[PDB]
């Protein structure tokens, strides 16, 4: 079971910090109890999901994941 | 500016940094040449095991390279799919006690060593209940890891001059960045953080090494070299040890 | 290791094949292997109900949960439970596996280092891992119990 | 780390008790010095980067090595590194300030000072004179803006030195 | 150092002119694994 | 709550922002009133005590029953014991204004320890409630708001 | 201080030097000198 | 230590001089010695006293002294009172230097260890102090007790 | 420790008399002694026989004492002929006393340490250990061969 | 060798070193020499693979014998492919003056292409040493120097 | 560090300006860059037929790789022709810096802990580290022979 | 050990006769013995000497011997020297030996545990052991200084 997330985090403090300035917009497949934590830390950081989409689980299946 | 609690806020001047050996940083990027991934790739099996497992040993995962190299998981995805693995427990989570396999995947993923007593009692507490899957996932997210890697840069060693350093772990960090790290086997971070608050200890006023064994015989101390064990503490010049008295 | 990969490392060092010696224990320990399966089963069946027994018999009702004890602070009495409860599931692991290294590689590795540095007494853990010993004695019996009790006295024996 | 508040808190936790008299009265005397304690460190925090750079200009006047061939703070790369580090002590003394207490400097300054100063071969002797710059124009900056009694003020960064301190007696 | 250790004087009172040395004191850790293991 | 502002603005590297100073000046002034609030629940521990005991054993009566754990003298002894515990704890947490040196001993790690003890902890939490009540009965309007603010953060944190 | 950890030197550089900072992009990435690292010191020694 | 080398030392290792604030310091312990000396000499006087009064209050009639308890037997009963004399004689010393240093060198420094090594318990050694420290309270007065209790609780802490 | 001395203790820490279990297991020691003092008397005979036969079955002709083993240097043969006199005396006492606690006070406290720490190998101890069992357990007897062979398969299980 | 330089100091965040603009100029001045070698090794590509093939069918007959892979003459036109295919690459390298470009094409997955193939590899690598013989044959010195430098990376990759 | 970096360090903690020693030594290490480029270019070409002889030379063929041997294993093996390479390369690092300080920051520094930890005989190393010196004295010549075995040799000397 | 025992010691665990390697590594030592004996002898003149110009170079007029410094107090002077004359002596052990196993047997066993249990300052301590080569080298030649110098880069790498 796991989601394609497309997402948008800045930092908000790249300039105190002096860092890298790296992409911060990425399309990634995560597990399925991991979106949880990472949804909650994408908007941490204020970040706009903008579509969450299944890749591999089928919905309403109870065994056998 | 950290995040959290017990850890402390530095800052380094400017001038400071630029005047230090600079690392490579490899970002992912996904669209780059057929050597630029692969290059990308040995940093990845460089940083998190400490020695390259290819061209070395030349055993390693050629499953997830496949996904890498295209795009399907980005870096931060892949760092954690890589520790959570039956590779990594053989050399990292099956030779150590659980408090330094703490420390050991703190300089894997983020890069430094235990910042505070309160840092290894919670991250003690995760692995405790969930094991080497639930540390890393508690380790790869956080927010020391997602300001300093992101999504797609490769975790890299920051010493004394890539970031600001505190007074209080630099000892044990020290000696944490190094090859010779993964053979200490004894907890060099939660003995002196949990030395900090407590009075001192009963060992010899020349280190710890100098304490013998008393087996009738003797002619034993632990050498400093054949497993470290090092913990000196700074008596003074009037201390009196206690002793038992037969 | 295993006492498998024990016999076939002593064999192996040696350049020697697999002699009538190292047979005899490997048909030994799949000989045991029937009691050790069954006796790791009714250990992970009621693992708290054996470390709550263990500290009503040693712990509780001392001076160590009063204040100034080790095990008055409440993550402490939390902290407790954690270790008895590695050292019961470690000591299950060396059960099975029927070689006690891991128990010398996982467990009593920085132990003494990490109990001499944080203050804990290491008597009373010492009778805490006994009265462990007692009770998982009592509920496996005594021809598992026998095996049990060698890997917790390993343990207790490392530790002091 | 301990407040002055919190330290009572934690050596009557050990013994198991509840507040007595004596508790009490230390805390009436950190309740009717705290007016005064916020003050001071407002103070303190309003001129600090001048303070910073009028100990630096001090301790240059005190020992010339310091910013000579055989020193320490030698160029602007080694100079910035010794201002920040007086931009620290300033920083937990005035923690150590509101706090009330000792305990946030020994917890997270002096903790692993000896290590790195000995490590990056930094001297300990002028940092202790550098501290004691710092603490006499903190003296007479609290001595400006009101405070009379100014002995709180004079603590935190005698403890700092007694701790840096390579002692000899 | 074996002279200045038999000259001191804590040699010659606790221990005498004519009686064999002998383990007089050990280390808490000494002690530790001593006393404290299986069988007590 | 000093300690908090304090690694609150030691995470950051910036000082401690003067809305922090002033709520620390704010807590200076209001520590006396803190004072004699801690002194009158120091002064009559045993009645309230007394009282939580009663209203609990009253309402729930499974501890005083014999498949209940505090069954016997010896088990309700430590079970006042234990509510003795907790009004000290409020105390301290009265005094220090914030609820750290209350949860850092009597609520990190509570859960497990009344688990693996047989105790259920929703009795505990009522018997936190009658001291709250007690306490209530026992202080004026603007005192047992601001005791039933730490006796609040301890029923919420058992539960 | 009560206790102590164990402390060590440290090196950090005083200044970047080219011919410091080009063995060390070697050894950031454990190989030898590529066919123009060494390239660029031959004209370096010559150049001095 | 003293606090009058203890201010010399923190003088000394700047290589200032004595300032205003150092002769403050000096001249406040100056100040306090008069009842620094006279706490000195009422605790000399009856030190057995205080240490009867401070087993009968904290550590008699209890399972400690009763068979099972650590001061069950005769001798460990007199190591109890070789302690507590040890506790208030340095904490007297501690006192009229004016300076905890001696504790932590003399005492404190390897008490903890010996204290696990022998199974002693630590909570009943704590009340045990806090009872000393309540009875030479009461028997010096407030005024220098403040000064007594200061360092019993520092004896106290650092046992924790 | 004896076994009358651990009798006697574990009546004491309760501050229980002598009751008739305790009697009953003075009694067993006091008819087993006869057999216990004879064994001791047949393995003080030729104790230096016993450990020739036990280096000849167990640890002669092997690589050990080859170059590379840890017996080639001369040295090292006579300390493991000192070592193997050690652990049949110290059974010897510990029959003698009916009594493990000796093994455990004088030889098994830091002997792993010292034998990790001098390389020596701790399987062919174990085995060295075995056929001293053998030895002295075809030399006495059956009836307190049984007995010998308890304490030195407690010295080989606590090395282990 | 100018993208070499380029992610070298790219995955730094600083800008190409002096140094290494030093040696960018140096290829660039170089760069003439380089492009007489490839040509000179471009036209007389079919010498070269002929007298490869006479060395190695020399050296080793297996593949020539039936149970080796290039037995007949369709086989054997496979093998002189390949070893015109690695003589290009080796041109390629040349011009380039780093092997990034000839190994991105012809050394980064080889040994499981020849062993997926049947084919060893010593033999493809005497086949380019052979090639670096009749091209050192074919060349000046400090050409035949410059040459036997990538035909050596060659060589030394297919081990 | 480099032999320009150590000169302009050593002028550098004294306040000195370039004094003509300096210049010296600066212009010494512009002569001798020249070999050194082409010594580091050769020693690039074939460091693992380096490698190989030098097993073939030191380590092959003897007791090492045999069962019992510490390069018995196949990862054992990988290992060693691992840590061969390395002293290998930072030898050509400090060869063409001019300067051993590198060896002594990257290698040197935390070596014989390891060694003495995982149980690596050392006179091994060293007398493969001088196959190593001698196949590659022989592979360049000796003018630039000669530094190659000084770093060598400063590893060797290092080790030991 | 010397190098002739390392020799000796090395063909002994192989179970080796003297072949010509060590021939070769014998004479050459032998061949070797005539400077390193004069040199231990001109080393052993003015020891007092070398120790005072190399304090005169490195530690004299710093803030060392300032107060704050770790050398102010006049009995850690005399300690310095005394550290000074004894890496100075056991590096003409080891010179005289060619075998620099004494200096880890004896020097850098436990030394960098005394010296950050002191606090002692390690940089200052390679510095001076550095002037100390220094001094020496131009003392006794190149030729010796050599060797001297190798031994003494030896103390001062496994020092820090
Ligand atoms: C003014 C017209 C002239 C001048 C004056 C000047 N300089 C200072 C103070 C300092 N100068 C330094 C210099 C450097 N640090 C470096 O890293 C380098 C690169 C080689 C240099 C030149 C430093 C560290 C200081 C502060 C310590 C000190 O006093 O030396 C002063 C004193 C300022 C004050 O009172 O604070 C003055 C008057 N320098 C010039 O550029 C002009 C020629
Ligand atoms: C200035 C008064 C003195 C001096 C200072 C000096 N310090 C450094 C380098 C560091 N100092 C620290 C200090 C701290 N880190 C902490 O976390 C704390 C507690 C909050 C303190 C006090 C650290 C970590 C460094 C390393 C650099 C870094 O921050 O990463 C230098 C630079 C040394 C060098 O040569 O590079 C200097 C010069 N030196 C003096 O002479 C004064 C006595
Ligand atoms: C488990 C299911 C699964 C598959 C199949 C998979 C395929 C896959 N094939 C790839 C490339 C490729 N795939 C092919 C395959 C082919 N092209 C052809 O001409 C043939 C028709 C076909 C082979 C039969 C080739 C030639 C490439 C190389 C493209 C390149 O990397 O430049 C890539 C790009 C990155 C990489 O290989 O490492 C992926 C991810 N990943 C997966 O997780
Ligand atoms: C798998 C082997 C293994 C063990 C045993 C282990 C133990 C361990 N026990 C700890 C603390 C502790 N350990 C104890 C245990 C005890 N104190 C007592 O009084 C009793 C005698 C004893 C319980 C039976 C206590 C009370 C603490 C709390 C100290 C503190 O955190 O403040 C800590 C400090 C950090 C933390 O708990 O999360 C570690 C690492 N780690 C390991 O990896
Ligand atoms: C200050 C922090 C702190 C806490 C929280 C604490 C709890 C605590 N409660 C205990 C027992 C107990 N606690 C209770 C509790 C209760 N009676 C009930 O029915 C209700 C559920 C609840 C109270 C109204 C009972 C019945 C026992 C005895 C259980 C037993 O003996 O097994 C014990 C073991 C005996 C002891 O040593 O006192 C501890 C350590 N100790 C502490 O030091
Ligand atoms: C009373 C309990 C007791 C024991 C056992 C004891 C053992 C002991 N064995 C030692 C050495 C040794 N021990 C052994 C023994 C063995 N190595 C082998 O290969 C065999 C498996 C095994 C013999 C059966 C050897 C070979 C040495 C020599 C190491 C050396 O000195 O170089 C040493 C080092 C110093 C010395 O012998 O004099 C001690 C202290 N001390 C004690 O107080
Ligand atoms: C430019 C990068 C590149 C390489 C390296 C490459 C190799 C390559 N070699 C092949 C066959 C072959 N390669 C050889 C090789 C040899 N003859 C021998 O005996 C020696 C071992 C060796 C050369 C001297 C042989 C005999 C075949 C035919 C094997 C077959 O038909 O199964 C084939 C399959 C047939 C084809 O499509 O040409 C490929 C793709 N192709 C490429 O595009
Ligand atoms: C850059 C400097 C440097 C060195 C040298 C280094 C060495 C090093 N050698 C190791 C193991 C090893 N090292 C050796 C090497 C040898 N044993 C012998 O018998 C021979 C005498 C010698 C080879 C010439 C062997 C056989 C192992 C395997 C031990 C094992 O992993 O089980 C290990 C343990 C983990 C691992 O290899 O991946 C390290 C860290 N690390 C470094 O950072």
């Given at each position: 079971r796991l989601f394609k997330i497309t997402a948008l985090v800045p930092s908000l403090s790249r300039t105190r910090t002096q860092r890298e300035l790296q992409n911060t917009y990425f399309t990634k497949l995560v597990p399925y109890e991991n979106w949880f934590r990472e949804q909650q830390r994408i908007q941490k950081a204020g970040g706009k999901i903008i579509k969450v989409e299944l890749a591999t689980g089928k919905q309403g299946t109870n065994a056998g994941l | 500016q950290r995040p959290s609690g017990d850890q402390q806020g530095l800052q380094?001047?400017?001038?400071?940094?630029?005047?230090?050996?600079?690392?490579?940083?490899?970002?992912?990027?996904?669209?780059?040449?057929?050597?630029?991934?692969?290059?990308?790739?040995?940093?990845?099996?460089?940083?998190?095991?400490?020695?390259?497992?290819?061209?070395?040993?030349?055993?390693?995962?050629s499953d997830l390279e496949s996904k890498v190299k295209n795009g399907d998981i980005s870096m931060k995805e892949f760092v954690r799919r890589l520790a959570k693995s039956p590779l990594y427990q053989k050399?990292?989570?099956?030779?150590?006690?659980?408090?330094?396999?703490?420390?050991?995947?703190?300089?894997?993923?983020?890069?430094?060593?235990?910042?505070?007593?309160?840092?290894?009692?919670?991250?003690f507490s995760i692995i405790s209940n969930g094991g080497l899957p639930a540390l890393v996932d508690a380790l790869v997210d956080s927010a020391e890891y997602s300001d300093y890697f992101g999504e797609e840069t490769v975790p890299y060693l920051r010493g004394l001059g890539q970031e600001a350093q505190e007074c209080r772990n630099?000892?044990?960090?020290?000696?944490?960045?190094?090859?010779?790290?993964?053979?200490?086997?004894?907890?060099?971070?939660?003995?002196?953080?949990?030395?900090?608050?407590?009075?001192?200890?009963?060992?010899?006023?020349?280190?710890?090494?100098?304490?013998?064994?008393?087996?009738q015989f003797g002619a034993i101390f632990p050498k400093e070299t054949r497993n470290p064990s090092t913990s000196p503490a700074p008596f003074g010049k009037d201390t009196r040890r206690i002793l038992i008295h037969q | 290791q295993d006492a498998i990969t024990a016999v076939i490392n002593s064999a192996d060092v040696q350049g020697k094949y697999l002699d009538t010696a190292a047979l005899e224990k490997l048909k030994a320990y799949f000989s045991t292997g029937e009691l050790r399966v069954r006796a790791a089963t009714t250990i992970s069946a009621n693992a708290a109900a054996i470390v709550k027994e263990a500290v009503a018999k040693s712990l509780l009702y001392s001076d160590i949960t009063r204040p100034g004890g080790n095990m008055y602070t409440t993550r402490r009495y939390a902290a407790c439970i954690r270790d008895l409860d590695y050292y019961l599931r470690y000591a299950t692991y060396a059960m099975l596996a029927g070689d006690p290294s891991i128990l010398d590689e996982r467990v009593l590795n920085g132990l003494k280092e990490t109990y001499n540095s944080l203050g804990v007494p290491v008597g009373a853990t010492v009778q805490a891992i006994q009265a462990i010993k007692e009770v998982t004695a009592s509920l496996v019996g005594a021809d598992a119990g026998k095996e049990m009790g060698i890997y917790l006295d390993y343990i207790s024996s490392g530790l002091s | 780390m301990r407040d002055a508040v919190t330290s009572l808190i934690k050596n009557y936790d050990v013994a198991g008790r509840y507040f007595d008299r004596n508790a009490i009265d230390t805390?009436?005397?950190?309740?009717?010095?705290?007016?005064?304690?916020?003050?001071?460190?407002?103070?303190?925090?309003?001129?600090?980067?001048?303070?910073?750079?009028?100990?630096?200009?001090?301790?240059?006047?005190?020992?010339?090595?310091?910013?000579?061939?055989?020193?320490?703070?030698?160029?602007?790369?080694?100079?910035?590194?010794?201002?920040?580090?007086?931009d620290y002590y300033l920083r937990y003394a005035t923690y150590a300030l509101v706090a009330g207490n000792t305990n946030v400097l020994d917890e997270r300054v002096?903790?692993?000072?000896?290590?790195?100063?000995?490590?990056?071969?930094?001297?300990?002797?002028?940092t202790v004179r550098g501290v004691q710059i710092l603490k006499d124009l903190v003296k007479e900056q609290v001595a400006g803006a009101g405070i009379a009694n100014t002995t709180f003020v004079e603590e935190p960064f005698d403890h700092i030195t007694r701790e840096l301190s390579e002692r000899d007696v | 150092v074996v002279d200045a250790i038999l000259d001191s004087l804590e040699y010659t009172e606790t221990f005498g002119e004519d009686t064999v040395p002998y383990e007089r004191y050990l280390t808490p850790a000494g002690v530790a694994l001593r006393q404290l293991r299986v069988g007590t | 709550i000093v300690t908090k502002s304090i690694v609150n603005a030691d995470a950051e590297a910036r000082y401690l922002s003067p809305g922090e100073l002033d709520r620390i000046k704010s807590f200076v002034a209001g520590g006396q009133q803190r004072l004699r609030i801690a002194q009158a629940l120091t002064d009559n521990?045993?009645?309230?005590?007394?009282?939580?005991?009663?209203?609990?054993?009253?309402?729930?009566?499974?501890?005083?029953?014999?498949?209940?754990?505090?069954?016997?003298?010896?088990?309700?002894?430590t079970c006042l014991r234990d509510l003795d515990y907790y009004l000290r704890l409020v105390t301290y947490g009265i005094v220090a204004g914030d609820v750290t040196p209350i949860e850092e001993i009597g609520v990190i790690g509570v859960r497990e320890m009344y688990k693996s003890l047989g105790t259920p902890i929703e009795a505990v939490g009522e018997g936190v409630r009658a001291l709250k009540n007690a306490a209530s009965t026992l202080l004026s309007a603007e005192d047992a708001a601001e005791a039933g603010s730490y006796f609040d953060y301890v029923v919420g944190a058992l539960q | 201080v009560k206790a102590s950890g164990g402390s060590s030197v440290a090196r950090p550089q005083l200044y970047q030097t080219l011919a410091v900072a080009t063995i060390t992009q070697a050894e950031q990435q454990d190989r030898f000198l590529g066919r123009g690292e060494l390239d660029e010191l031959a004209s370096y020694f010559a150049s001095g």
């Open positions: - | 380094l001047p400017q001038i400071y940094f630029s005047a230090a050996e600079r690392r490579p940083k490899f970002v992912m990027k996904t669209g780059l040449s057929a050597t630029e991934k692969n290059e990308v790739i040995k940093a990845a099996y460089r940083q998190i095991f400490e020695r390259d497992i290819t061209r070395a040993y030349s055993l390693s995962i050399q990292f989570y099956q030779p150590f006690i659980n408090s330094r396999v703490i420390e050991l995947a703190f300089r894997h993923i983020l890069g430094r060593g235990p910042s505070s007593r309160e840092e290894v009692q919670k991250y630099w000892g044990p960090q020290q000696d944490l960045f190094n090859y010779s790290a993964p053979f200490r086997k004894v907890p060099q971070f939660i003995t002196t953080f949990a030395a900090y608050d407590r009075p001192l200890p009963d060992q010899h006023p020349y280190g710890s090494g100098n304490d013998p064994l008393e087996i | - | 805390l009436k005397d950190y309740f009717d010095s705290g007016t005064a304690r916020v003050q001071a460190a407002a103070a303190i925090n309003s001129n600090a980067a001048a303070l910073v750079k009028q100990a630096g200009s001090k301790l240059f006047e005190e020992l010339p090595e310091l910013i000579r061939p055989g020193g320490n703070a030698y160029t602007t790369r080694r100079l910035a590194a010794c201002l920040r580090d007086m002096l903790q692993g000072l000896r290590e790195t100063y000995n490590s990056l071969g930094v001297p300990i002797g002028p | - | 521990r045993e009645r309230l005590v007394k009282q939580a005991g009663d209203q609990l054993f009253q309402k729930r009566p499974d501890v005083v029953s014999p498949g209940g754990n505090a069954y016997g003298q010896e088990m309700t002894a | -």
